[PDB]
């Protein structure tokens, strides 16, 4: 797996694509978010958010 | 099986009521996952051995004597039945709560 | 300054959940129902004895005979009956109080309040 | 046994002894911590392999961090005298 | 230039969170979570001196504050103590890894130590776990501490409320 | 939206800010030019650590390196992003 | 602040404190372990050894035996001192055994000291045993030293900081005799009386079944203090001793700190 | 190989106290009762001297020619 997945990187533009230059993925996973800066396979939990603003009154 | 994490002087090491300090300590969160019932079992019939002075024989199916009868008897020799003791710590004196 | 002060006696103190735990029931005037979490070492109180309770973030005046905290006031629900619960966090150790106009909609207090919470010997 | 300073100030003080373990450092301890004055006092063992503590103190700026610890090497030196002098007589 | 790479690309404490999903590799382990769960119970009372002692292993120095108890006798409390080292805005209202049994009670009025509930930064009621501090549990407070306070805030936690945990520990006494 | 939404969302998000790649990248480059000769472009006396590296995070930090990054887009397009705060 | 005796043995000593701190207490028995001296074979000097153990072995073993270091301490320099040369503050000890046809155990009795008031403690500690035709011819000396260098160097075995008792018997549970593992309690007439209170460890095992005949308290500002030495110096001179090690660190510390404040 | 000279938890001396032990068992004496009345009272010291094997009267006729 590691020998044919070796020569992928991201572009400037968000595409994925080999370094012989064929694309692979016109925009990295579906919305161009790294998993290691997703809250747990997610972009942003929206309810953690409203957690953090109000929750001290709730 | 394990390795030496670090060495321990006989000031600093958490001595009992009578003295006794121990020769090597071992993790609780070690037992519950192995499941090496045995373990304690040969410790409280250590314990029991050398306070009595009698032959312990630990050979499977056939094991005398029983543990009831060693806690008994470790109970008769001034211990307490459960191979519990009371300890001390000894780098600050303060008597542990359990 | 929104002090609370009430004179009631205790109903019972049963044994709780945890290992050492206690709770300590008082049923109050004004149809007050404190109930709160003690431990071994504060159990100064008998089965049924007459105490005067305080809330109020002011620091009262307490002696060594007497049982009190300080702790945040985080917990304000309604019931379907419309009665109250309301509850005070004295860094762990839960206050309940069951009451009629609730402690925060009667405007006695707000969200989040530091408060002081003593009960003594009358 | 060598001492030195990490911070100084009115009502803190930081000190690093070199060459003492838990038997000074307790003692140091507890003697401030009885000391009037006194809101904070601790000890620390940075590594079991070294033998070296640093003590932490801080006063409420009545007296002086400085102050507080001569005033417990003062008390516990006095508790060591009285103890050699009741030994003596038994 | 291979040192600069190293440093600024490779330090651990860049990397507590995992590629492989959204959660951090290091956490909690095994006498951690022990000590936490036994200094983060309801029953926990400390006096001045026992304050001290558990204290002292850490950097904090500072104003402890009044004891959460101030008669008969002045006590501390556990959770009073861990509340010194979280974030000022912190909230987080989840379950623990108690929460499974008997003692499900869903909701913040729980007779147990069974729901966690932090509001600005102050541990009001629950116990730590590891569903809050235990390694390779994403969506734990550990997590979102990490996530809204830099890998700086995780590495100054983990190195300081860590200690008090084995402190304590070995402070009472666990044996089996 | 040329051809996505999301990608338009992405090079509006890295139009003015650094990789982690390019500020290690710089790092490594001034660190280079400061270990033989290279004065630096700010007072080495403050400083708690003497090494190169540390100096040349502190320079980085406050803004005063004179170096600009080439950006060069899949279809030819050529960004430069300056440094220096100025 | 009166301190009480308990018991006096040949060896052990046990003590009640009445107005000191924990933690002087504390202190007091990690220095009676770690900065008290005594004498104790530092170096070996092999000329012949046949026997089965090893050279390390045999000076090991030489090492571990305690000698009689009680006058030694006002004619011999203190490791604290200068002490590695200007001889004067060594001592020496020669061994020169043979067998010469049967095997032969070699005791502590055949030990040699140059100066006659430093001799081994016990003259019955079996050193090595040599077989037929086996020979050793050793010089060993002797040095004062702290136990905190060194374990061959304290003067105690055991050095012990407890809490102090109080059992009050309100009813007349008879299960306690029996359950007590210090036999504090008996049973005379059937009133369950407490004999020796201050054998209780506060083990709380009686309040698991008697559970309201028996109280357990501990007195909050006295302590039992009871070291056992062994041998080479008696328990009074090594509490002393200690003491004295605490007073000197102590006046160290603040000299050094008072100056350049 | 040969009895230790101090208990190894304790610093007892319990090397003094084997010769006595090994006879008086060997005599038909029960172990405790004799381990008692040495003055062996803590059970590491015990058990020091209840697990001693003494090789080296056997190791003595197989020495170093040295
Ligand atoms: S039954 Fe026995 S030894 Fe100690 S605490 Fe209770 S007394
Ligand atoms: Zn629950
Ligand atoms: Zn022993």
Redesign the pocket.
Known sequence: LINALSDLRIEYDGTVRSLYGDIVQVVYGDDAVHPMYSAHSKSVNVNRVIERVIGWKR | KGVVGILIDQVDMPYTAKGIVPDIILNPHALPSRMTIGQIMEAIGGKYAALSGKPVDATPFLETPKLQEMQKEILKLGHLPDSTEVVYDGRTGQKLKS | KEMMQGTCKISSIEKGALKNLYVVKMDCDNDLKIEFDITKELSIFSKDEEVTFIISREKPEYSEKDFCAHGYLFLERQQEDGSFIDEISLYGLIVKILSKNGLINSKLFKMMDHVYYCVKKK | MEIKVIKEEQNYLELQIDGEEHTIGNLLKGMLLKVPGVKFAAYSLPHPLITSITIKILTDGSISAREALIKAIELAENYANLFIDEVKKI | EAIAEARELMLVHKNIITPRYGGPIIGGGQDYISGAYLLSVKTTLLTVEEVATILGVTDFVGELGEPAILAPKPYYTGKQVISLFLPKDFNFHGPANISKGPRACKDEICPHDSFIVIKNGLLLEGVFDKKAIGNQQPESMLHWSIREYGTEYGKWLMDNVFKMFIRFLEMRGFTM | MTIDKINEIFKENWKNKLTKYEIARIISARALQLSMGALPLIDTSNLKSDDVISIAEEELKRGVLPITIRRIYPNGQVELISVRKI | MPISLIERNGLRLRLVLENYPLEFVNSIRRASILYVPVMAVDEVYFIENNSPLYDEILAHRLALVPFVSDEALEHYRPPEECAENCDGCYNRVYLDVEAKDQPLMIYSRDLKSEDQMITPVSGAIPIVLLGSKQKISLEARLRLGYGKEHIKYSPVSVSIVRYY?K?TVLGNCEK?VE????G??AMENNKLVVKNEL?????????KYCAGS?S?ESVENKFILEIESVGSLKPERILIEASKSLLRKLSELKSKLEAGK | MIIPIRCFTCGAVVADKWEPFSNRVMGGEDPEKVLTELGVNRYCCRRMLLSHVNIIREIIHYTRPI
Do not use: G, Y
Not at chain 7, 179 to 182: A, F, H, L
Not at chain 7, 199 to 207: D, M
């Open positions: 008792p059992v306690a359950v007590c593992p210090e504090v309690f054998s209780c460890i506060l083990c709380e095992e009686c309040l028996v357990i």
